[PDB]
Design an enzyme around this catalytic site. Structure first.
Site, short mmCIF file in Angstrom:
data_model
loop_
_atom_site.label_atom_id
_atom_site.label_comp_id
_atom_site.label_asym_id
_atom_site.label_seq_id
_atom_site.Cartn_x
_atom_site.Cartn_y
_atom_site.Cartn_z
N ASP B 162 0.81 -1.21 0.00
CA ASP B 162 0.00 0.00 0.00
C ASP B 162 0.84 1.27 0.00
O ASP B 162 0.72 2.11 0.89
CB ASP B 162 -0.96 0.00 1.19
CG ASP B 162 -2.01 1.09 1.09
OD1 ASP B 162 -2.34 1.50 -0.05
OD2 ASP B 162 -2.50 1.55 2.14
N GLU B 399 3.15 -7.74 7.53
CA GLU B 399 1.93 -8.37 7.05
C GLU B 399 2.13 -9.50 6.02
O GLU B 399 1.55 -9.46 4.93
CB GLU B 399 0.96 -7.32 6.49
CG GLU B 399 0.50 -6.31 7.51
CD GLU B 399 -0.57 -5.37 6.97
OE1 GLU B 399 -0.81 -5.39 5.75
OE2 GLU B 399 -1.16 -4.62 7.78
N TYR B 455 -7.29 -2.74 12.48
CA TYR B 455 -8.15 -1.65 12.04
C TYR B 455 -9.63 -1.90 12.36
O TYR B 455 -10.50 -1.67 11.52
CB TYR B 455 -7.99 -1.41 10.54
CG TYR B 455 -6.62 -0.91 10.12
CD1 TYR B 455 -6.33 0.44 10.07
CD2 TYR B 455 -5.62 -1.81 9.77
CE1 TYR B 455 -5.08 0.90 9.69
CE2 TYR B 455 -4.36 -1.36 9.38
CZ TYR B 455 -4.10 -0.01 9.34
OH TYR B 455 -2.86 0.44 8.95
#
Ligand SMILES: [Mg+2]
Ligand SMILES: [Mg+2]
Ligand SMILES: [Mg+2]
Ligand SMILES: [Mg+2]
Lengths: 587, 587
Positions: B162, B399, B455
């Protein structure tokens, strides 16, 4: 006259004439049929509905016209056109015949439809509105004409005030069928007992012709009869007071009889509450009140200055949620709908005539020809709003040139007019401009409450909160010293703030600086014993005209024009919910 | 190798080759002269300097070329090109001859200039950079080729991460004149006494050829000699520890002698501080530490991923002012300049290799051919940063698909590599993704600290903080229960927030919701004893590629990309200045 709010009763058939009217910016012969080439909504401002700047900036006569079908009108009835307002001037026509006229864009007026048309199938109503402002109008404008050298005259109004000259029919137009002999006014006053448990009610019912009996029934909020009289006076026990953010309203059903039969019936609401200004305090029901709220504007997107009841309730709900308790009708009387809403929600209202712009861009009072319009404005406002328990104070002017010679002679009879007309004799004030420092001002001795518009840190000492704090504290102490027993209310204080603008360095126009500005302001305010109120400028962003200091309108709102909050809203809710409505800072 | 930071010493002439280079996106023959039709700056990302989308989205070989005048080089000296980094791959040419190659866009490498050119007037340096990413590179990209049916091949990189695939020469390029027999590495370790008043220093100085004597002088912050040795070991008294936001740095001046004359000299800084992870706590100098800070990015306007020292200091000053104490080099090693700055300012740094994107859009570990690049990344990072007292923990991956079969076998030798290479044996962690819940994850047993990217309220339970709070508390308790003695650090948590977006109804993307999101998060965090740190995502808004979830980049920053604060910044400063750096939540 037309002071009474339009109601549907068994004797009064009230029809709404809102909707689409044939429209034209320019000259028109009311003997002729206005085509449907252009249309316009009633009620709304016409301005933001124009796509081009040319038509939006139009100044002069503009027409509304529509053919309206006549309803049943009996022998003892008459038919009138009741305008909530027309901004700013209006001539009313029925089938091309002049039948009514009004000057002033924020007060109601009624116009009689000729009786010879009551049996006609249809009538043509023509409204010749006009948005010209000059030195004879309220508000004051700078009028001028320039020839385009094409042979035509182009009119221009340079506003003497900080808001866009929105115009049109802003409020509901009603077609009213009422008895010829009707109630045209109702005045309700009350004297509260020493224990605040009882009340002596006085009623003054005015009819245009003689009546045999005036019967008045009083009902509480449970719609239960608590008293009745034929003598226009009534004693009440176990009364429930109208309180701040805790309103209680009674209803007075007034019936007039002729020859033992009902002639006319009307219902007027009222609240029981006491007001007194004394010893640098503002007393509501004999308790020290601290004003927390906003200077507002009748302003939304699309509708402009047009009535939006949803907007009224949304704003007042936000007001209540933040812990606020009041607002000011700056800078003109608001809709009756707003006043009645404030009555219902227990919100304090500082009622204000359109006396803004009494200041030459010295010698202001040798140029202002506003005396006649000012007297009418006061007469119309008081007559319309005197029964509202929410109305707690009148404003005689907003930021006039009160430091110049002639100011005192101008305002002394106008302050007196408020006292003479108002049956409650509520306090009247004058909203003071920053140029008129305690030494220079020569008018504040006339009023009961000192209202100040101060922008230390924004206009003076721009972006310098350090020097701003010294300046505001210095002057506030001077006002308190010059008028030791007059309460002080800050009616305007703020900083332009565009949503999205941010900085760590206390930069003007950013959301952080708005917080910093108000934080400094409040630190000063809390140290002034006689300061009994704070009303920010403004509740929300609003439209203004074109000038370099205005970044697409005024952005001093706590909320954006779409009613979205800015960063400071959270800070105000903290403060306003800590400070009670009844807050004595004499201790 | 090229682990040592380029210095100017009496034996080392270091010249900066920054400035304007002849540039070309596409094919080039280094035997030929690249014209000046297109130019490019070193150092910077080239992308945002392209006006068109076509050239900005370019994937493949792109060239830098410049004719450089050769300085004086003596008989015992050599000349090398020292690249801070080239993103992502590079082939280096001198006069058209291949002379060096490197893979990995965030680590330094040096390249020897042929000795036969030391007496030439000029040399032509050609840099063949390449920004292709695939399943063999770190970070991981999705590579593909499509024929435009014009006969040409158009390359495309679909990022598995990202952030925008910024490329170019992001860091300073140095021309270094050094002795052939020089110091190529210096390792500094220390054992602190029981009273923390003394320290046993160990030095490992590596030379490429034999030397008669290694003399090491140690100077404090007052530039005063506090010790010297020829035996690479030194005892110090009255030592001053390197502290959080209170840094103390010593300097090791290393001199090598051959035949009683100076051969080479270099100065390496170091700090005295102790690190230990035990009993669900992170100990710095034997005291429980609470991490407060940010996941960051090397990202600014214009320069993109290019080095901006001013930006580093501005960000770190903001970090210090807010009461924060740490940040993570997500998701790649940052510039040496940033690491040295963190050393000077006492800021804790979680050091991270570009191991992001190890996740197939299961069977991730049957498709990832990243083992070789991953091993090199760990080797290069540790060798470069091991002497930084600011570096307190290593990250092995960000991640990855740690819940799939094969994950444990992949990471076990990589975690081991960190432990084997690092002379301080600092804790290593793995930044965990939300899909890998405590039951599913099979890799967290290998690491010393549990780092979680969560999140709840944004990705899961979007705009539902009520259900979000239950979810985050539930999982955090599961992690604490599965690993009772491992400290937990939240390395990513945030909500996209566009400046100017406002609402009273807790609406995602508005500035108010960002505050609400973090307020809820912290309420949960404070109830977890093993949670010893909070690092928000992100410090500032940054650029990403095109996808529907990205509203012109990532807006989860506390600050805007121009380093202007959002509403939440004020809230974080309140919290982070109440919670001390040394904060024990076992009590
Ligand atoms: Mg002020
Ligand atoms: Mg106070
Ligand atoms: Mg979460
Ligand atoms: Mg805590």
């Amino acid at each position: 006259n037309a002071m009474l709010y339009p109601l549907l009763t068994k004797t009064r058939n009230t029809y709404d004439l809102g909707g689409i009217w044939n429209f034209k910016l320019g000259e028109h012969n009311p003997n002729e049929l206005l085509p449907s080439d252009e249309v316009m909504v009633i009620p709304t401002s016409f301005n933001d509905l124009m796509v081009s700047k040319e038509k939006r900036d139009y100044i002069g006569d503009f027409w509304y016209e529509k053919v309206i079908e006549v309803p049943k009108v009996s022998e003892d009835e008459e038919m009138v056109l009741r305008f909530g307002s027309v901004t700013h001037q209006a001539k009313i026509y029925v089938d091309g015949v002049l039948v009514g006229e009004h000057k002033g864009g924020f007060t109601p007026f009624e116009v009689l439809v000729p009786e010879c048309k009551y049996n006609n199938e249809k009538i043509k109503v023509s409204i010749c509105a006009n948005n010209v402002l000059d030195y004879t109008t309220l508000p004051v404008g700078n009028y001028s004409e320039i020839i385009q050298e094409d042979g035509s005259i182009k009119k221009k109004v340079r506003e003497n005030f900080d808001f866009f000259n929105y115009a049109g029919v802003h409020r509901p137009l009603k077609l009213m069928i009422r008895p010829k002999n009707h109630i045209f006014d109702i005045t309700i006053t009350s004297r509260l007992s020493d224990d605040l448990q009882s009340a002596d009610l006085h009623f003054l019912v005015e009819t245009n012709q003689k009546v045999d009996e005036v019967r008045i029934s009083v009902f509480d909020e449970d719609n239960k009869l608590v008293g009745e009289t034929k003598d226009s006076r009534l004693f009440l026990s176990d009364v429930h007071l109208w309180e701040v953010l805790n309103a209680y309203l009674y209803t007075a059903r007034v019936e007039i009889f002729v020859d033992n039969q009902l002639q006319d019936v009307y219902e007027e609401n009222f609240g029981l509450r006491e007001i007194e200004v004394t010893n640098g305090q503002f007393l509501l029901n004999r308790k020290p009140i601290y004003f927390k709220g906003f200077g507002k504007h009748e302003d939304t997107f699309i509708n402009g200055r047009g009535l939006n009841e949803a907007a009224n309730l949304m704003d007042l709900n936000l007001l209540k949620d933040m812990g606020a308790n009041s607002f000011r009708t700056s800078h003109y009387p608001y809709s009756e709908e707003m006043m009645r809403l404030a009555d219902r929600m227990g919100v304090l209202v500082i009622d204000e005539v359109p006396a803004v712009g009494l200041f030459q861009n010295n010698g202001t009072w040798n140029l202002m020809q506003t005396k006649a319009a000012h007297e009418q404005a006061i007469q119309e406002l008081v007559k319309r709003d005197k029964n509202h328990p929410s109305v707690v104070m009148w404003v005689v002017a907003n930021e006039p040139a009160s430091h110049e010679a002639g100011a005192h002679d101008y305002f002394e009879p106008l302050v007196k007019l408020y006292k003479d007309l108002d049956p409650q004799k509520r306090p009247v004030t004058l909203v003071n401009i920053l140029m008129a420092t305690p030494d220079r001002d020569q008018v504040m001795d006339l009023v009961d409450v000192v209202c100040l518009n101060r922008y230390y840190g924004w206009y003076v000492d721009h972006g310098d909160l350090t020097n701003a704090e010294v300046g505001i504290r210095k002057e506030l102490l001077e006002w308190q010293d010059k008028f030791p027993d007059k309460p002080i209310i800050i009616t305007e204080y703020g900083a332009d703030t565009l949503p999205g603008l941010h900085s760590t360095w206390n930069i003007p126009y950013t959301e952080e600086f708005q917080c910093d500005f108000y934080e400094m302001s409040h630190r000063v305010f809390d140290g002034i014993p006689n300061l009994v109120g704070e009303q920010v400028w403004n509740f929300a962003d609003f439209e203004t005209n074109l000038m370099i200091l205005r970044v697409q309108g005024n952005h001093k709102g706590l909320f954006s024009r779409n009613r979205q909050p800015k960063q400071v809203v959270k800070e105000f809710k903290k403060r306003w919910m800590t400070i009670p409505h009844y807050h004595n800072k004499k201790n």
